[PDB]
């Protein structure tokens, strides 16, 4: 399996274009309200739509009759309708028995599905659904189906739909032209596939059929020609600002460089030269270079100029070396004066975001580019490309099975988790079921249960956390100290145990009206053991309110396991177990399961208060990789400082 | 040529041709005596190859000669043998240079929309190359055929 | 770019005058023949591949250009020319919808004369190829629409020549 | 900053395969001096033909004060 | 115009106008006689609207005609009467075109820095069009004025 | 761009000799007039819109250009002329601060002559607009600073003509 | 680029005929002298930095061009000429390997002649530098391949002049 995941954000491909879709998206890409044009697109469609309902309603009802009259004309030698699911060029009627039942079932359903897609075409009001699904169909159907028989079948249906309807010339012509498009697209052979050639050796070459880029909403492409009237020239410049700055900033804040605008309006500098000068401008520098790391600003510079994310590990490595050498100008210069930029946009065309629909996509930087094309990209300040690309070659990282966000910070108190929304730093990794996470023991390294399972109930001797035990006799256990004995020495020890037992369940010491006084005195009397006392504090409504309720279910399970057992979960096997209990039984039973677990009983007895036994490598790094606490012999060469021989 | 492909790849990285790149040239220049031999046996023996290729095509595809076809006229039928003669000409250019580039630039780059605008089927011409391949390699000797084989196969790939 | 209605605004705008009777009657003509402009463009849109196909058939096919030595021989060159003729057709289709010839000079005829001279494209054959479209398109849309179609197609070839 | 008034046609080699829209390959633009070496090399690698180049911005044989 | 917005968007999409887009052009052309009727009434009483809303502007905003303002005597008053004459002419151009294109191309682009250089307040010239909308709506029928006001409020909104 | 300091440095570097007393006097002249140049630039930056305000009013306004059929009729073109004259003021201020007319020769008068001929912008009225700036900018800061700016504005006048 | 092997192919492609014995004799010459070209390329590749220095010291260094007043005085311009001659040798190696001077016509002499006139780069000094390259590369590789190398370096010399 793969060791890294870039993310799997929802992809929404446009299967076919409708009139409302074509109208709305036209102004959406331009970042405008629907003007007198785009409103009139809808107005004429909504008026005709009532008639377009009557087209389909007749054709949906009489669908059985159209396909029956078609199949009878085409297929000879029996009845084709036994197993229902004008210009002849030179067709020969196909025998029913000779063609075979399996081929006949295909033939019949396609004839119905051709008419079905015609009815959808009128209702949509755009023959896009036809153009896509009919263009590259002649070639694939040629193998085991005659083309000559299909043309006359559609032409029969054209006449069949004409005679059955026949209302008005303003009504029937919609039926006629859509059928006329249908036969013309079917007569047309399969066009050449769109070949996305790799710009260098590092990036793979791709191919996309001439059907996928026929529906998936074409990105509006603006080119600065010197003769254009200044209204559409303004539309080009606004689009150029919408590409570089992700949004129209000249409308928002009136932030515009008129010095550069004037030169492009004339034709002194090209759009290639404009993008160059605009991306090295202090206006871009402040917004997409200054707030970001060198790696992330590089990743943003890719989508602004080239209109795509970095494709390969080698590409990020190359372009980071450029931005380290000469900075932002040198990076911009490398991006504009590339073989890719001049191939896609040339000199005149404004850069555009080439995503799922525009071109063929590679299976490498899918989710990394999906989040990048979003407007929420310049808030993810953690790089997504260089992180995933490096993690691809490496094995599985030190991470919780349900992501990096599921890992809490290894602190004394407070369940603090990285938020998915606030500062996107989600790092998915394909963890399987039987994947045990390597955990660092607080005590001796030999006392790890992975290598030494017998030494699970061994106390950390001044290496890890302090162990609290009810070793000493509880006050008022035996009737030796009769009535009096005001100075019973064994009283402060059990109270310190209670406080520590509170400190383990809830990281911090609680307030006055939060302490369970009933549970405390039962432990002090010797009615319940520590195991029962820890269980009661974790079964408290306060623990539910503070740690369980405000947090994500599996985050709350993970933190509870780090508090009750003092250990992060090894992997899926344990996490799925408690998550199954959380679904069926509830929170209280999850508490019960973690206490009544065998590993709890082995590590901590009936008198032992739980403690931090194991840390995550990331957690220990936070503790012992700071300026202090770090030893000299961790990751540094130690030279023996000896007095010189001349001294 | 493979000579051009090396110096393109070297210029792309802005460097001189490498040790393995120069040896790739060295290997081609030695086997150039065989490359010359490919040309003569196909150019002079064109009339036998072209006639065998066309008779096998129109037998397997009796549609273009049939009513409502593509090549019904005698001037149209000569154009089908013209293409056959041009493709085998392109094969010779490819082998001699050593790579697909001569075939690529002349008769592969944008070849689908070529015959789309002439109503000639590309799935019909993908079967035309195969019978031309079968006729050519049959006349060629055993060790000579295996050299000329993958050049024909690339044309098949780009068609359909 | 402008239209037939936008040009009559701009011609009255330079004088700084309201829409007079000489401007109003020119507004009538385009508004009456506008329905004829829509229908013919819809026919062209549906049969976009056919006109280009038939234009080459009676001009460039079985000719000196397609024979080796010209600029129509290779499949790289041939596919480029039919792409151009498709574009020349498309921008002409926009021209008749607008009722303005300045759209040709706008996007197409910016410097397509001199860029053809740079690559060594024969102009005389290209003009004849443009002329070939006129006969095919007029038979498809009609004599009334084809004459209106012919003007903008003539505007393409005249600037190239 | 010295700028070159450059005039070059750069025909697309992949336009047929990529199936992208037609762009005006002939352009008369101003290009910075620091970028011109990378600009010229890019054009002539695509098989583009340079027509006319003029030093519009700057003085020929300048030592101090460029940018 | 609507027909300009068709082609510009069609070239951006690099494809022919769709039947949905063609239905818009159909509706605009057929409904072109109705929109021409708007301009005919406005060009007829071009003196009436500008004068009536002109005195309304000096009534509602006295500070303009009052000492200290832009309007002084007759020579600065006539230019304000000329400006209102220009904008009413601009409305009629946008009325016949069916779109807010000729209003923008001639007199709306950089209108803020235009009146900044003269010293004219932008909200005052917005108020003049507001009053011009009110008088024009009272002259013709209400349903006819609904289309007319839509191009008037565009002039107001950008100068607001 | 070359400032008054770098112009002396460049000239000395061409011959390849050290800064002598014959070249150092030019530097001494700049450092003496440096207080006058900065103070003037502060006045121009203060009245950046105010200089343009008067200049257009006394030369360009109530003329043939602002009238329909001209080049200053449309608000788009009007704002462009306002935009132009603030560049003619800002870069002349740059030239005053630099102490050399290198900036105007490269970033302003690159192809400004060819641009004004192509579009149809009247050069004669533009010259008058610069002369309108010159008279306003002189009677705002002083006679010495005004004639300093006047030289750089004359460079714009000679460049456009 | 157009190699010597592809030169006879492209010539036959324009003719639309098969390669004859009067055309394949040139191809046979390329196949025979090909092993000489590879070894020549291998020597130049290894000693790429040394060929430049031995040529610059012979012609350019201790002259008027390297001294103040010249075009090869400043370190910025010195590094440019070193870069140029590095590219001059590298592309001459390509033409030597390909066997044709088409790459010198495409990827060298495309607009190089006119850039040198624009900046005021001495044409006579550049020719002398390439002639200095020619004599060094002939001494390093040999008289057999160096004379062949000298043809392509003459093409640059004739191209610049
Ligand atoms: C040296 C002290 C130790 C070390 C460094 C090391 N770094 C890389 C590669 C990268 N460096 C970075 C980090 C940054 N990106 C930023 O934005 C910033 C802040 C301005 C920095 C410092 C990144 C993202 C990379 C990746 C780019 C690349 O591939 O070079 C390496 C190379 C590792 C590799 O080849 O994958 C190294 C070695 N590591 C050590 O061993 C030293 C102790
Ligand atoms: C007081 C100076 C300012 C302040 C404090 C404040 N803190 C919290 C809550 C928490 N404090 C911590 C931090 C720590 N965890 C550790 O391990 C240590 C070191 C031993 C510390 C100090 C944590 C984890 C929390 C979260 C909840 C908890 O108590 O476990 C709050 C409440 C925040 C909330 O909304 O819940 C506050 C207000 N804030 C101010 O306004 C003072 C300037
Ligand atoms: C010996 C080859 C080198 C070396 C080893 C070293 N390791 C540690 C500490 C730990 N080792 C591990 C790793 C694992 N536990 C697992 O579950 C697995 C997978 C099966 C492995 C390999 C862990 C978790 C620790 C932390 C302590 C613990 O046992 O929980 C140390 C001590 C580090 C310290 O400072 O505490 C050392 C020295 N280092 C060398 O010098 C050798 C080259
Ligand atoms: C025969 C195998 C099939 C066939 C052929 C056929 N082709 C055409 C049209 C043309 N084909 C070419 C040839 C080429 N273009 C190139 O670039 C190359 C590589 C160098 C080749 C081989 C060209 C340019 C044309 C058009 C030129 C002309 O018409 O003279 C036709 C004519 C179309 C028609 O019917 O009018 C034909 C018949 N036809 C089949 O059905 C066979 C499968
Ligand atoms: C066909 C009628 C003749 C022909 C055409 C031909 N032209 C070229 C070169 C190009 N033409 C274009 C296309 C356009 N540029 C534009 O801006 C427009 C308007 C929208 C058009 C139509 C371009 C850009 C090129 C350059 C190549 C590219 O695709 O980028 C060629 C190719 C020349 C070559 O060998 O490179 C051809 C073949 N030539 C003929 O022989 C016909 C008579
Ligand atoms: C009246 C509504 C308000 C007003 C008017 C006012 N305008 C000016 C001066 C000018 N107004 C324009 C505007 C245009 N002329 C055009 O050609 C166009 C495009 C169709 C427009 C919109 C211009 C350019 C001028 C200059 C005069 C000229 O044409 O030469 C003034 C005079 C300002 C002065 O002192 O110079 C006035 C008073 N001002 C108000 O306060 C009224 C609310
Ligand atoms: C005002 C004094 C006169 C006037 C001006 C006018 N200019 C244009 C168009 C342009 N102006 C420039 C000039 C510059 N842009 C720069 O970058 C610089 C240097 C900092 C300057 C001075 C350019 C390049 C253009 C063309 C592109 C653009 O419009 O910005 C116009 C518009 C012309 C048109 O119709 O497109 C106008 C009106 N016109 C007059 O009548 C005044 C005397
Ligand atoms: C002395 C500090 C060290 C040293 C000097 C040395 N330099 C050269 C060669 C040249 N030096 C230059 C460089 C410059 N010319 C300029 O215009 C500038 C910038 C203002 C400089 C610094 C040049 C052009 C030459 C070429 C000589 C010529 O006049 O043509 C040499 C000679 C190298 C040789 O053997 O050919 C020497 C010795 N070398 C040392 O060892 C010292 C540490
Ligand atoms: C050295 C032989 C002589 C010399 C060279 C020199 N050249 C420049 C400037 C440039 N040279 C080029 C030319 C090329 N670009 C290409 O594509 C090729 C072919 C591979 C070449 C050689 C370019 C583009 C420049 C501009 C520099 C840049 O970085 O863009 C200079 C500098 C000119 C100046 O005044 O700044 C020099 C000095 N001149 C001599 O004196 C030598 C005899």
PDB file of N, CA and C in Angstrom, chain A residues 105-143:
ATOM      1  N   UNK A 105     -29.759  -7.324 -27.322  1.00  0.00           N
ATOM      2  CA  UNK A 105     -30.119  -6.667 -26.073  1.00  0.00           C
ATOM      3  C   UNK A 105     -29.409  -5.319 -25.967  1.00  0.00           C
ATOM      4  N   UNK A 106     -28.172  -5.263 -26.480  1.00  0.00           N
ATOM      5  CA  UNK A 106     -27.379  -4.045 -26.540  1.00  0.00           C
ATOM      6  C   UNK A 106     -28.004  -3.078 -27.544  1.00  0.00           C
ATOM      7  N   UNK A 107     -28.384  -3.612 -28.714  1.00  0.00           N
ATOM      8  CA  UNK A 107     -28.899  -2.845 -29.839  1.00  0.00           C
ATOM      9  C   UNK A 107     -30.222  -2.164 -29.490  1.00  0.00           C
ATOM     10  N   UNK A 108     -31.082  -2.884 -28.755  1.00  0.00           N
ATOM     11  CA  UNK A 108     -32.421  -2.428 -28.415  1.00  0.00           C
ATOM     12  C   UNK A 108     -32.352  -1.318 -27.367  1.00  0.00           C
ATOM     13  N   UNK A 109     -31.493  -1.504 -26.354  1.00  0.00           N
ATOM     14  CA  UNK A 109     -31.419  -0.600 -25.214  1.00  0.00           C
ATOM     15  C   UNK A 109     -30.763   0.721 -25.614  1.00  0.00           C
ATOM     16  N   UNK A 110     -29.857   0.666 -26.601  1.00  0.00           N
ATOM     17  CA  UNK A 110     -29.150   1.833 -27.107  1.00  0.00           C
ATOM     18  C   UNK A 110     -30.104   2.721 -27.902  1.00  0.00           C
ATOM     19  N   UNK A 111     -31.014   2.082 -28.651  1.00  0.00           N
ATOM     20  CA  UNK A 111     -32.023   2.756 -29.456  1.00  0.00           C
ATOM     21  C   UNK A 111     -32.998   3.515 -28.556  1.00  0.00           C
ATOM     22  N   UNK A 112     -33.281   2.942 -27.378  1.00  0.00           N
ATOM     23  CA  UNK A 112     -34.130   3.558 -26.371  1.00  0.00           C
ATOM     24  C   UNK A 112     -33.374   4.671 -25.646  1.00  0.00           C
ATOM     25  N   UNK A 113     -32.072   4.445 -25.418  1.00  0.00           N
ATOM     26  CA  UNK A 113     -31.215   5.340 -24.656  1.00  0.00           C
ATOM     27  C   UNK A 113     -30.787   6.539 -25.504  1.00  0.00           C
ATOM     28  N   UNK A 114     -30.795   6.369 -26.834  1.00  0.00           N
ATOM     29  CA  UNK A 114     -30.568   7.464 -27.767  1.00  0.00           C
ATOM     30  C   UNK A 114     -31.729   8.455 -27.697  1.00  0.00           C
ATOM     31  N   UNK A 115     -32.956   7.917 -27.654  1.00  0.00           N
ATOM     32  CA  UNK A 115     -34.181   8.698 -27.574  1.00  0.00           C
ATOM     33  C   UNK A 115     -34.316   9.318 -26.184  1.00  0.00           C
ATOM     34  N   UNK A 116     -33.827   8.597 -25.165  1.00  0.00           N
ATOM     35  CA  UNK A 116     -33.876   9.026 -23.774  1.00  0.00           C
ATOM     36  C   UNK A 116     -32.972  10.238 -23.569  1.00  0.00           C
ATOM     37  N   UNK A 117     -31.817  10.238 -24.246  1.00  0.00           N
ATOM     38  CA  UNK A 117     -30.850  11.321 -24.160  1.00  0.00           C
ATOM     39  C   UNK A 117     -31.296  12.518 -24.999  1.00  0.00           C
ATOM     40  N   UNK A 118     -32.163  12.268 -25.990  1.00  0.00           N
ATOM     41  CA  UNK A 118     -32.761  13.317 -26.803  1.00  0.00           C
ATOM     42  C   UNK A 118     -33.793  14.084 -25.976  1.00  0.00           C
ATOM     43  N   UNK A 119     -34.545  13.355 -25.137  1.00  0.00           N
ATOM     44  CA  UNK A 119     -35.561  13.937 -24.270  1.00  0.00           C
ATOM     45  C   UNK A 119     -34.902  14.775 -23.176  1.00  0.00           C
ATOM     46  N   UNK A 120     -33.733  14.318 -22.703  1.00  0.00           N
ATOM     47  CA  UNK A 120     -32.953  15.027 -21.700  1.00  0.00           C
ATOM     48  C   UNK A 120     -32.338  16.290 -22.298  1.00  0.00           C
ATOM     49  N   UNK A 121     -32.053  16.253 -23.609  1.00  0.00           N
ATOM     50  CA  UNK A 121     -31.402  17.336 -24.332  1.00  0.00           C
ATOM     51  C   UNK A 121     -32.333  18.540 -24.472  1.00  0.00           C
ATOM     52  N   UNK A 122     -33.624  18.269 -24.716  1.00  0.00           N
ATOM     53  CA  UNK A 122     -34.639  19.301 -24.880  1.00  0.00           C
ATOM     54  C   UNK A 122     -34.925  19.938 -23.520  1.00  0.00           C
ATOM     55  N   UNK A 123     -35.030  19.093 -22.483  1.00  0.00           N
ATOM     56  CA  UNK A 123     -35.316  19.509 -21.116  1.00  0.00           C
ATOM     57  C   UNK A 123     -34.161  20.365 -20.589  1.00  0.00           C
ATOM     58  N   UNK A 124     -32.924  19.963 -20.914  1.00  0.00           N
ATOM     59  CA  UNK A 124     -31.726  20.721 -20.581  1.00  0.00           C
ATOM     60  C   UNK A 124     -31.656  21.995 -21.420  1.00  0.00           C
ATOM     61  N   UNK A 125     -32.078  21.889 -22.687  1.00  0.00           N
ATOM     62  CA  UNK A 125     -32.116  23.008 -23.615  1.00  0.00           C
ATOM     63  C   UNK A 125     -30.776  23.244 -24.309  1.00  0.00           C
ATOM     64  N   UNK A 126     -29.821  22.334 -24.076  1.00  0.00           N
ATOM     65  CA  UNK A 126     -28.484  22.421 -24.639  1.00  0.00           C
ATOM     66  C   UNK A 126     -28.083  21.049 -25.180  1.00  0.00           C
ATOM     67  N   UNK A 127     -27.675  20.941 -26.471  1.00  0.00           N
ATOM     68  CA  UNK A 127     -27.310  19.656 -27.073  1.00  0.00           C
ATOM     69  C   UNK A 127     -25.922  19.160 -26.661  1.00  0.00           C
ATOM     70  N   UNK A 128     -25.449  19.631 -25.498  1.00  0.00           N
ATOM     71  CA  UNK A 128     -24.145  19.289 -24.951  1.00  0.00           C
ATOM     72  C   UNK A 128     -24.115  17.814 -24.553  1.00  0.00           C
ATOM     73  N   UNK A 129     -25.235  17.329 -23.996  1.00  0.00           N
ATOM     74  CA  UNK A 129     -25.396  15.949 -23.556  1.00  0.00           C
ATOM     75  C   UNK A 129     -25.313  15.000 -24.755  1.00  0.00           C
ATOM     76  N   UNK A 130     -25.665  15.513 -25.942  1.00  0.00           N
ATOM     77  CA  UNK A 130     -25.603  14.759 -27.185  1.00  0.00           C
ATOM     78  C   UNK A 130     -24.159  14.756 -27.691  1.00  0.00           C
ATOM     79  N   UNK A 131     -23.575  15.957 -27.824  1.00  0.00           N
ATOM     80  CA  UNK A 131     -22.267  16.184 -28.429  1.00  0.00           C
ATOM     81  C   UNK A 131     -21.206  15.316 -27.751  1.00  0.00           C
ATOM     82  N   UNK A 132     -21.286  15.209 -26.417  1.00  0.00           N
ATOM     83  CA  UNK A 132     -20.322  14.482 -25.602  1.00  0.00           C
ATOM     84  C   UNK A 132     -20.450  12.979 -25.859  1.00  0.00           C
ATOM     85  N   UNK A 133     -21.692  12.479 -25.825  1.00  0.00           N
ATOM     86  CA  UNK A 133     -21.971  11.056 -25.703  1.00  0.00           C
ATOM     87  C   UNK A 133     -22.127  10.392 -27.072  1.00  0.00           C
ATOM     88  N   UNK A 134     -21.954  11.166 -28.152  1.00  0.00           N
ATOM     89  CA  UNK A 134     -22.239  10.690 -29.498  1.00  0.00           C
ATOM     90  C   UNK A 134     -21.015  10.843 -30.405  1.00  0.00           C
ATOM     91  N   UNK A 135     -20.096  11.747 -30.031  1.00  0.00           N
ATOM     92  CA  UNK A 135     -18.956  12.126 -30.855  1.00  0.00           C
ATOM     93  C   UNK A 135     -18.018  10.935 -31.053  1.00  0.00           C
ATOM     94  N   UNK A 136     -17.527  10.376 -29.939  1.00  0.00           N
ATOM     95  CA  UNK A 136     -16.600   9.256 -29.965  1.00  0.00           C
ATOM     96  C   UNK A 136     -17.307   7.924 -29.731  1.00  0.00           C
ATOM     97  N   UNK A 137     -18.383   7.689 -30.498  1.00  0.00           N
ATOM     98  CA  UNK A 137     -19.229   6.520 -30.325  1.00  0.00           C
ATOM     99  C   UNK A 137     -19.211   5.647 -31.580  1.00  0.00           C
ATOM    100  N   UNK A 138     -18.908   6.260 -32.733  1.00  0.00           N
ATOM    101  CA  UNK A 138     -18.914   5.591 -34.028  1.00  0.00           C
ATOM    102  C   UNK A 138     -17.866   4.479 -34.059  1.00  0.00           C
ATOM    103  N   UNK A 139     -16.691   4.757 -33.476  1.00  0.00           N
ATOM    104  CA  UNK A 139     -15.528   3.881 -33.531  1.00  0.00           C
ATOM    105  C   UNK A 139     -15.754   2.636 -32.673  1.00  0.00           C
ATOM    106  N   UNK A 140     -16.282   2.839 -31.457  1.00  0.00           N
ATOM    107  CA  UNK A 140     -16.412   1.782 -30.461  1.00  0.00           C
ATOM    108  C   UNK A 140     -17.585   0.861 -30.801  1.00  0.00           C
ATOM    109  N   UNK A 141     -18.522   1.359 -31.621  1.00  0.00           N
ATOM    110  CA  UNK A 141     -19.724   0.620 -31.975  1.00  0.00           C
ATOM    111  C   UNK A 141     -19.531  -0.100 -33.312  1.00  0.00           C
ATOM    112  N   UNK A 142     -18.499   0.308 -34.069  1.00  0.00           N
ATOM    113  CA  UNK A 142     -18.195  -0.197 -35.402  1.00  0.00           C
ATOM    114  C   UNK A 142     -17.895  -1.697 -35.359  1.00  0.00           C
ATOM    115  N   UNK A 143     -17.254  -2.137 -34.267  1.00  0.00           N
ATOM    116  CA  UNK A 143     -16.662  -3.460 -34.126  1.00  0.00           C
ATOM    117  C   UNK A 143     -17.705  -4.566 -34.300  1.00  0.00           C
TER     118      UNK A 143
END
